[PDB]
Amino acid sequence: GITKASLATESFISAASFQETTRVLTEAAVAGKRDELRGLKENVIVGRLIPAGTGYAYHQDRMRRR
Amino acid sequence: IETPITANFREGLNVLQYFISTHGARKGLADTALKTANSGYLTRRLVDVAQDLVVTEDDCGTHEGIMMTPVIEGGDVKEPLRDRVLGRVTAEDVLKPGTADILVPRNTLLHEQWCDLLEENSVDAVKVRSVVSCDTDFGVCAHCYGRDLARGHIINKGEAIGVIAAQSIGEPGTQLTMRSSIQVKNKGSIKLSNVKSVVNSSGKLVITSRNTELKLIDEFGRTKESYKVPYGAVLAKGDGEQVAGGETVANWDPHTMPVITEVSGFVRFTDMIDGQTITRQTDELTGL
Amino acid sequence: VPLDGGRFATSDLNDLYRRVINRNNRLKRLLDLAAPDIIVRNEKRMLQEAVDALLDNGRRGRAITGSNKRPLKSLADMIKGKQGRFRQNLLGKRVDYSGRSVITVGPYLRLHQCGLPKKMALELFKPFIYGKLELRGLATTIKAAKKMVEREEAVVWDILDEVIREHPVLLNRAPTLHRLGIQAFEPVLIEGKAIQLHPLVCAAYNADFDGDQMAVHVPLTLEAQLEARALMMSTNNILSPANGEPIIVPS
Amino acid sequence: VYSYTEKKRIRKDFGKRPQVLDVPYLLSIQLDSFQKFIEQDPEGQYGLEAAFRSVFPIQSYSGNSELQYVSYRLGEPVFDVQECQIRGVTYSAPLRVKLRLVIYEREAPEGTVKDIKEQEVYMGEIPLMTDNGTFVINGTERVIVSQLHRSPGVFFDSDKGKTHSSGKVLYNARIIPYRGSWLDFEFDPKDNLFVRIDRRRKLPATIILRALNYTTEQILDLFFEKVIFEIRDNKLQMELVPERLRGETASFDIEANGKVYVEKGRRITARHIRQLEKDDVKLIEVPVEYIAGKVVAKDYIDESTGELICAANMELSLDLLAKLSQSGHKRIETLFTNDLDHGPYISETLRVDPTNDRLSALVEIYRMMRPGEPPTREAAESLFENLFFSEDRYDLSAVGRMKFNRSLLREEIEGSGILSKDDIIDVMKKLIDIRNGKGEVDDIDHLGNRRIRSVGEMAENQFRVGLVRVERAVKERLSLGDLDTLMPQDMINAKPISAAVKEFFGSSQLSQFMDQNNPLSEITHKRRISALGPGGLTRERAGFEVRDVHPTHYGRVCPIETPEGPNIGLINSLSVYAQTNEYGFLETPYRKVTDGVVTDEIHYLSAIEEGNYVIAQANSNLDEEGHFVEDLVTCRSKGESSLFSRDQVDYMDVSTQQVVSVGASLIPFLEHDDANRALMGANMQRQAVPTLRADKPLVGTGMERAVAVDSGVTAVAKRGGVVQYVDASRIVIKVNEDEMYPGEAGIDIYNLTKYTRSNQNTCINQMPCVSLGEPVERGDVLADGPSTDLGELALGQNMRVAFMPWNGYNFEDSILVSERVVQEDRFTTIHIQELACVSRDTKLGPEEITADIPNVGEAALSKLDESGIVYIGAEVTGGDILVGKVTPKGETQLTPEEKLLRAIFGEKASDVKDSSLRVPNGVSGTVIDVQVFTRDGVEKDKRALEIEEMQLKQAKKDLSEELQILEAGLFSRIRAVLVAGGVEAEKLDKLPRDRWLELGLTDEEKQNQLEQLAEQYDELKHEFEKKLEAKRRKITQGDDLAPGVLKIVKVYLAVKRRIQPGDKMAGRHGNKGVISKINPIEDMPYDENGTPVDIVLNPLGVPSRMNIGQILETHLGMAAKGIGDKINAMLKQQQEVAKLREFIQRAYDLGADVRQKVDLSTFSDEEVMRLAENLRKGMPIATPVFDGAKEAEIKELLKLGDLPTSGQIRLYDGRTGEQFERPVTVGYMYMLKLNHLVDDKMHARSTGSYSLVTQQPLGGKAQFGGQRFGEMEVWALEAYGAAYTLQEMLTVKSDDVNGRTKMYKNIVDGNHQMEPGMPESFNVLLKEIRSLGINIELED
DNA sequence: ACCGTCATGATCATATTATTACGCCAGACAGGG
DNA sequence: CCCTGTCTGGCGTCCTCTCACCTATGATCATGACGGT
Ligand SMILES: [Zn+2]
């Protein structure tokens, strides 16, 4: 279901901007999880270009130049 | 309430009629002012499950996609195929309903001109590409989404479709509310699906399958009606037959589950002993 | 920070940290005083409950409180909830170069332009007017320009009509549900104090005129002016994205 | 006959039903409750005496001392209301209490105390109520709002359906005490019976029945009947009453008297019961399988062994029968446990019980209350006697005992406040009866179960909580000191009492700030039935049913006036005629319809007495005697409307206005509006603003005079008489002699309230409306208030409206207004703002109020005096300096070095930062009142002494005018005395006023009268002198301030606003609208007479938003103005009074059987000219709510004027000058300006201040802030492809500080470019997550 | 009129108890056929 | 040991505007007014 599916994501900021932050931050902390940003709300949190709209060319460029 | 409000607003409502009116309107204001919270929280859950999904390819390179048919509840055909397969790219190439013709090719967007050439040929159902069958890792390819919907063309490489989709489902959350036998209507041809049947002694084709779908196909090929016929019903008609508009074609009794047979012969009571298994209840008002 | 007066309105985290440090100093002094066990146990237990109350208050039995019976807000309550950092300061932010007023009709408009008052226009476009005034050579330092628009002389309105001209603004009705609730217009200056909004566009915003209010936002940089003209302009949103039906239907 | 202000302008009145009970005093809830609270009340209850007699006598911890209670008394307040609002004090009264201390001796607490002491003691300050019904807490006039909560008593709810997911309903029985521990009996799906106390852990219910000292034999004696088995020679025979066998299938062939009655396999019919009870069958025969599961009642013991044969409440087997049969028992008592009739709920409950006696039950109850501690029999007895059975901790009120006896079908409604054994046993009996299928459950929203608290009861409860804290303190101190040496003011202290009552009146959830911008808004905020607050529900949790109008709100709580939004139906408003019962419920009047005739006696029914009887509807036709003219009449029996016969009715409603409230009974034609639009119309009629010259409603309901006079904005005459001196400041009434006291000679002075600030920044003015030499009657208006006119209620103004689409400028709901409206200055209102400048003492130095300001011009300071505080009456704009204040700061770390350096320069060089009080951004207006509050011991500057001399001369001149005009009336009485009995016609007025008091006269009542008037003269002289000295010592003395503030300068601006495109106007039916274009005069659609229409609405709002009442109001307003134009035509031609009398009489008859029936033949040729002087701007018409003016009466009144019958005039155009096709509707609508203006919402920000903890802009308008680019707007920009717009929308424009300074340099240099960086609030997120044990980083 | 006594206001550390009245809806836990 | 009531936690709409208001106390030096000589 949609709230169990958005809280079970491979990106803990996406699952922490949404409902309960305690459960998700302890699960991510004891798992040692890492957030390869790669979505819209991680980049709205961290303050950069959205990887969808005009910023999709910027993220193509950055993903190409690694 | 069994006593209505016989006075309109040009005539005056008296006191009791206005008080019953206030019952009916206070319920509506409470429903909107509490409905809006669930509508907003639904939009939030939807844009946070979507949140990631970006059109990131141009073709996933597949041949799978869902089978768009017109939807029919049992009344007249509710939503036509041109509402469901408008601007969605076909999965395999649609055969023209005559015989084995390449009417449309296998990766064409179906805009209004293609949909009119679909409606002229009375095309049954289209196997079309759906987003849930997209093979793209981490995103949706540009063909399996479909038309842009506010642009005439296909979706561009990039445009966030998860967020516009989540907003478009949750945005009408305010307008939504919060709190015998089969009689045919039109005149056409009969077809049966999921059917395993047998002819009774009288002639009415009874069915030995519970899950039988009774379709009414017209003289053109498209499916215009559909119904669900239970296990053991008295069908007035048969397979492939032509009927008249309004003629009863089905009959059953839902309060009496039929234990009808396939063959004939004599009846024996196997493991039926009166006193422990079955009981003797002679009827009061009839005697049988 | 102190409020208006002579006392300091102290935060809740200072109460939490000050209690943990008071208890930790007491426990160091007891462990020093070789106190007996039954209650050094009480001292360490009070420290355990103090730390557990600092981190996530109220997850243990009934939450501590300073004034008056309301519990005080801990670190996890600075993160979680509707008013944490995610939902209140990182996903949604308060925004400079922005304005807000009551809307009204103005049916003379073309549907790519909206009316915008002169007082709001001179307040939202203060740096562009400063840059324009410094380019002409009328003034010298920045102060002089701020005195000029603080006085509102006769020459800054031509400067204002020369910073408006091809510069879109984002009008936004306050319950934005779908993407047609943020649309970019070109301003036409209004003698008045009310945003004049083209009527057809109202059916997109769900905006009647019974007391509604809208916010204006200014695209500062050049890529944002081009995004307002090429993606978010009101001429570009004539079909609703939920379907194929036109959203600029005459109401 | 009519009162003299009702001969000024007599309102035309339609309406058919002759009234029998007039509208009561609309503020009776507040005033009657608080009069019930504070008054010397004998016989114990109610009031403060209930608290002082329930918490006292405080007896000590066995020290034989006792602090008992005598009486109480409130002294006068030190400050009256006006000085209290000006200065800022509470409006309180000191509560003196006479307490007594007695101290008993040793070995005899029934012996003599050695010493007593009775004395006066100070405790608390309770705030009094003003005559308007409001409190003054800190200079701001506040209202405590009535609460609607659950009635104390038993309550049998049914948890229907939802539990256990199998449809088996539960039943709980919540006993709701007024003060103490709750008690919930309930069931469970195993059909066991479970008690719980205060929502704690759950126990089986009969554990409390053992706690009341019941043995198990007695419990089964109570809760079941008995079945008798007699062992008489054959198969253990049975006593059988066949009523238990109603529908049971027997296991054998029941025969008796040698006759087969019942067959095996069949059930016992009712006629077989009749056979067995007709033949009087007693003993029948049972098999050995019949008592296989019968449950024994009591214990049987064997006499030989002394053991127990079978325990109580146990089923019987073969061996138990074999044991008790051979022990000598012939009688066997069992229980009847049926499927439908009587379940064994008590029996299964006792089988779950582990306890066995009283002690174990008390131990288990003591253990479920306080978990995990050693119980003791004394502690368990003390706890269970202090839960329910003590006068201290448990108290049903009289309301609670009434509901608890009524819902258990008792007789006496009087009982003790504590429970007993019979009470709990009757609760369990009624719960088992409801489970058995007979009797019904009780709904919650039924208004027989919703009590109304008010100001008096809630203040009593908060005062009682203060007293139980102080009895904790007195029990501490009384037995821990030396006696006898102390007095009962050293023990009891006034801090918790005053803290409790000051916290309740100061900040509660029900002591709220009065919405005061309108007389209507006052008088409908004081009448409010809020469901929220302490003890009630909350907005964001509940619910569905409580937000819905129950069928018993009819005539108690208004159905249509409630705030839409998050709390609909919780902020209910009380109706017009609805009183409050003796207990606290709601009651409403009715008319006792005896068998044929509607008797005109009123008779108050509650909410549960209404249900049993049958009530006729309000507007039922009756022919002059009371006989109902139909033979089917619409009535309502038990919450359900129907059609009943002519003479089975028992009550009729009083008047047809009683379902609605006073907010929504000033709406004309209410019966034509759909209920949503009537709701929005009543709410916006509350939200109006007072204009400059308020006019009148042409189409009212006649309810305006009750709302105006019965509020407190007009100056109602106390004693009637003759006016002597009218002025804009004061009004002097000379009291008539047939209304007048013998002593205290008496001519009254009304000091009006001129331009002062309301709470909503409006301008609460009072204008005198009487002439000079004019008679006034008792109970009559003298001075109109805000939004009043001649004693009526004029909220907005009435203007010429036309319904036509006009070129798009009224598209959705907008309004288009001619310039003729703004030229007439008719929507110009007066606001008063109160700007304040405090001057504190910092630790860098004190602040000054000097006029010298660093780095400002002399032209900016020319509006100041030599003292630095602005003159009275200088029109300022935004940015002008009102109070020149500079920060007295600096301080260069003291020391000798700097000590000798300060002598050279001298004083202060420039260590004074500028922090003056300035006008807010973008207002104007006039400085009308300046106050200077100064701490005593600080030098008062020059303007402070100037204001003190001004107020001193004003007070002395005003009190001298009081004494002078009062003694002018007194000497005018003295002259009237001396003429009778010893006249000096021409001799008296020559000899002086001193020698009138001592002139001789005959010893009669006249000489005694002279002695009375003389001593009243001398007493008023001495009283004048002492109160002048008291007023001077109140003015000249210092003022209390906050700790550490030197002086406060307050400046009152009076802004005078106007109209503009963007304001909100609205009618009285829900037709809102932003006024969109202020057209010129010429463009308006005019008609074939010449007059332009003022406002052009939009017709399309009528068929969807179904408010059809505004079009009938428009047509009747045009009829009213047609009559007014014909009066203006017959008066402008200077016609004699005969033709005016003819036409006014024809315009006042005009209808069906109506109530008005006036005649002008008793107005005598001078009042008719003045009545026509008041009717020439239109004729006011009353239209009551549900008994209004029908269509044919509007047509007949439009025929009296020469207007067209259909109401529609053909209208030309202003632009083209050519006719509009299909003639349009014009008329007059009474439209209101709302105070949602547009130069209070408009705001703009380029770059202002920034917040401190997260570097984002501030929020609001007063703080110069930016609009919240919220979360859904971020979603809407993700939904496009706008990526750079969102990046600068949440990095550059908002948060990143180096990013935004780079941005500001780049914008003022022409380079549109952003250097992005990072949000600083994300670094705040890193520090808050990192301040836990969590290690968040940034990789690479 | 000066000297001594009762009264009354500053600064300052001490550290937590006798109310209840949402409505689902998952998720984990002791109980028992 | 697989169903199962029962208990515990965790949600519950966005944007805006106006107003008022945040424990009690228990102990003592030193200032301040009152009365005798
Ligand atoms: Zn795909």
From Swiss-Prot, chain A:
Q: How is it used?
A: Co-administration of salinamide and rifampicin or salinamide and myxopyronin suppresses the emergence of resistance to both antibiotics.
The residue ranges crossing the membrane are none
Q: How is it modified after translation?
A: Acetylated on several lysine residues in the presence of glucose.
Homology family: Belongs to the RNA polymerase beta' chain family.
- Known function: DNA-dependent RNA polymerase (RNAP) catalyzes the transcription of DNA into RNA using the four ribonucleoside triphosphates as substrates.
How would you summarize the oligomeric state and partners of this protein? The RNAP catalytic core consists of 2 alpha, 1 beta, 1 beta' and 1 omega subunit. When a sigma factor is associated with the core the holoenzyme is formed, which can initiate transcription. The rRNA transcription and antitermination complex (rrnTAC) consists of RNAP, NusA, NusB, NusE (rpsJ), NusG, SubB, ribosomal protein S4, DNA and precursor rRNA; S4 is more flexible than other subunits.
Q: What is this protein called?
A: DNA-directed RNA polymerase subunit beta'
Q: Which organism is it from?
A: Escherichia coli (strain K12)
Q: Which residues of the full protein are shown?
A: 1308 to 1373 of 1407
Swiss-Prot record, chain D:
A Pfam family assignment = RNA_pol_Rpb2_2
* GO terms under biological process: DNA-templated transcription
- So what EC number does this one have? 2.7.7.6
Name the InterPro entries for this protein. Answer: DNA-dir_RNA_pol_bsu_ext_1_sf, DNA-dir_RNA_pol_bsu_external_1, DNA-dir_RNA_pol_su2, DNA-dir_RNAP_su2_dom, DNA-dir_RNAP_su2_hyb_sf, RNA_pol_bsu_bac, RNA_pol_bsu_CS, RNA_pol_bsu_protrusion
Provide any one GO MF term from the record: ribonucleoside binding
- Does Nucleotidyltransferase show up as a keyword for this record? yes
Q: Which GO terms describe its cellular component?
A: DNA-directed RNA polymerase complex
Q: Is the Nucleotidyltransferase keyword given for this protein?
A: yes
Key words, A-Z: Acetylation, DNA-directed RNA polymerase, Nucleotidyltransferase, Transcription, Transferase
What this protein is called in its record is DNA-directed RNA polymerase subunit beta
